């Protein structure tokens, strides 16, 4: 079990770690987060008591270094660092962790929410999407554009998910345009699987991935690509048996975890209606078309 | 975007444009089989695309041969008609190709989009008229030529025959689109008003009787009065 601490908490904050959140005062006594469970990626996020506006935070993998969070009164921030000398952070943790000044990450042993959200993603794939190359966290926030976004400014402060366009030449062979327009088959399988991803783990941890960025910041498009993939996965008539299995099982969790609160604003009706009832794969994901009829039957 | 009655001019400017209407493209006759059951037999068809400045008009004839084996028919039809537009502009001089397509119906969009991802400077577009394109198999010459075709087969016309060295564009379609509504709402008053005179004939080179200016205001008033009319008929006004 890791730590992150926390130098000092100068603002009022709410302060996420990954499903879980809570207030923080005004110079009220945190030093951090503790007991963060090894093995997963993670995601601290913050949302300024002033300031709703522009949620941000950073993922990162407790193996990947020794991280903690300091505010910076200049940028008006709570910033995410790495401290280089171990035992300095020991001895800084090991006294925060006898006073008491820090929350436990709070994760009920039955549960395995967050495993199951973030099966597929990985940190170095991650840094792939959010490119700061100097850190081994990454910082994402509410209003951070994606590459696409920026084909229809500022390129070192985008999320580069993989382009899918279903009007595009890369996703239509000549003279096959009929058969590839409405069975996006080769476009999952060849393009995108055997051509881009590589295989259907690397394709599933960036929706994965791009769900939790919509879901946590409400980046826009981060969830315009959550959308585009499972769309690309279920207009393909020919999908392998174990990609329909896991997706039915990652869409699963991402709509049980989903607050209802921002369910409108998260959830594409018209998506969503046509991957469960027009598309090819209408009858192969009995576990989100359950879920999401007893859980957003106005939505559909 | 799309096209409506604020933007009807920029029809007639010199950026190159076409319409396409595809609702001739799939057609069918219902009958009973033996059994009492019910099944179509396709007859020809043909894509109309007509520049609306010079009133060139491609007319595409699809043989019913390309529906030989073919499931959702209807659905075919639409990217044939994609495939065959986008065919054509590949023919033709680049300075010859349109800068819009303007198609007749929504469904068409994105079948003409994917196949003319090639051409992304191209304006793929919608309208809001309600244009009477689909009365084109009307014109007794057009059907003709459809019906003979036993292959696939371009032919191009000129629908406007020698009108556009009397009058603009402009009212040169105005004229077309009254004819073929004239002829969509009732096919036999409006042919009688063409025809009725056998003094005026239609030349071997056109499609409509070599009219007069004078003569074409009484028949272009006759046509008006005939749609009046059935939309009475219809309505009971
Ligand atoms: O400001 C700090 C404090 O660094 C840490 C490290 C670990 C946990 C913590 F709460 C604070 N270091 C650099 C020299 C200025
Ligand atoms: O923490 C949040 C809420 O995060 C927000 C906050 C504000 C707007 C928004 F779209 C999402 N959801 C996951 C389950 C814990």
Same mark, same amino acid.
């Given at each position: ?9 100068? %603002? =009022? ?32 996020? *913050? ?7 522009? #949620?941000?935070?950073?993922? *990162? ?7 903690? %969070? ?44 967050? @495993? ?14 959010? #490119? ?14 994606? /590459?696409? =976004? ?12 993989? /382009? ?16 590839? *327009?409405?069975?996006?088959? @080769? ?28 879901? *946590? ?8 690509? &959550?959308?585009?993939? %499972? ?39 018209? /998506? &969503? ?15 989100? =078309?359950?879920?999401? =009829? ?7 | ?84 537009? $986008? ?44 244009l009477p394109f689909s009365?084109?198999? $009307? ?70 009787? $070599? ?9 272009? $008033?006759?046509?008006?009065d005939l749609i009046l009319?059935?939309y009475g008929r219809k309505?009971?006004?």
């Amino acid at each position: 079990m890791n730590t992150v601490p926390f130098t000092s908490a100068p %603002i =009022e904050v709410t302060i996420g770690i990954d499903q879980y959140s809570f207030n923080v005062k005004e110079n009220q006594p945190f030093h951090g987060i503790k007991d963060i469970p090894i093995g997963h990626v993670h995601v601290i996020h *913050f949302q300024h008591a002033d300031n709703s506006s522009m #949620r941000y935070g950073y993922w *990162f993998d407790c193996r990947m270094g020794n991280f903690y %969070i300091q505010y910076d009164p200049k940028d008006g921030l709570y910033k995410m660092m790495e401290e280089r000398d171990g035992a300095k952070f020991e001895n800084i943790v090991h006294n925060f962790k006898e006073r008491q000044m820090m929350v436990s990450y709070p994760k009920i042993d039955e549960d395995d929410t967050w @495993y199951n959200l973030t099966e597929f993603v990985q940190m170095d794939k991650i840094r792939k999407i959010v #490119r700061k190359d100097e850190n081994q966290f990454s910082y994402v926030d509410s209003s951070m554009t994606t /590459v696409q =976004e920026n084909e229809l400014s500022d390129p070192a402060h985008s999320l580069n998910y993989t /382009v899918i366009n279903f009007k595009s030449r890369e996703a239509i062979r000549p003279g096959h345009e009929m058969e590839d *327009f409405l069975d996006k088959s @080769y476009y999952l399988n060849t393009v995108m699987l055997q051509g881009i991803f590589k295989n259907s783990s690397n394709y599933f941890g960036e929706l994965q991935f791009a769900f939790l960025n919509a879901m *946590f910041f409400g980046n826009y498009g981060s969830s315009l690509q &959550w959308h585009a993939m %499972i769309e690309l996965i279920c207009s393909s008539a020919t999908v392998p048996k174990h990609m329909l299995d896991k997706l039915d099982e990652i869409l699963y969790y991402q709509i049980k975890t989903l607050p209802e609160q921002y369910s409108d604003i998260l959830l594409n009706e018209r /998506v &969503w209606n046509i991957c469960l009832y027009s598309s090819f794969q209408k009858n192969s994901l009995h576990n989100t =078309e359950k879920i999401m =009829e007893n859980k957003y039957p106005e939505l559909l | 975007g799309a096209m409506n009655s604020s933007n009807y001019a920029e029809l007639f400017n010199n950026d190159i444009k076409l319409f396409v209407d595809d609702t001739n493209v799939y057609r069918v006759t219902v009958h009973k089989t033996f059994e009492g059951n019910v099944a179509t037999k396709a007859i020809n068809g043909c894509i109309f695309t007509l520049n609306p400045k010079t009133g060139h008009l491609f007319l595409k004839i699809i043989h019913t041969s390309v529906w030989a084996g073919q499931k959702r028919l209807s659905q075919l039809a639409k990217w044939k008609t994609a495939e065959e537009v $986008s065919a054509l502009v590949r023919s033709l001089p680049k300075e010859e190709q349109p800068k819009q397509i303007i198609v007749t119906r929504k469904a068409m969009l994105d079948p003409l989009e994917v196949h003319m991802l090639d051409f992304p400077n191209i304006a793929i577009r919608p309208t809001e008229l309600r244009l009477p394109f689909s009365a084109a198999m $009307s014109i007794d010459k057009l059907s003709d030529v459809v019906m003979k075709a036993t292959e696939p087969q371009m032919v191009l016309f000129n629908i406007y025959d020698d009108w556009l060295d009397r009058i603009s564009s402009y009212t040169a379609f105005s004229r077309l689109t009254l004819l073929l509504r004239a002829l969509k709402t009732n096919e036999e008053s409006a042919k009688m008003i063409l025809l009725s005179d056998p003094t005026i004939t239609i030349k071997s080179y056109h499609l409509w009787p $070599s009219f007069t200016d004078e003569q074409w205001i009484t028949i272009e $008033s006759q046509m008006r009065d005939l749609i009046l009319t059935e939309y009475g008929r219809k309505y009971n006004v």
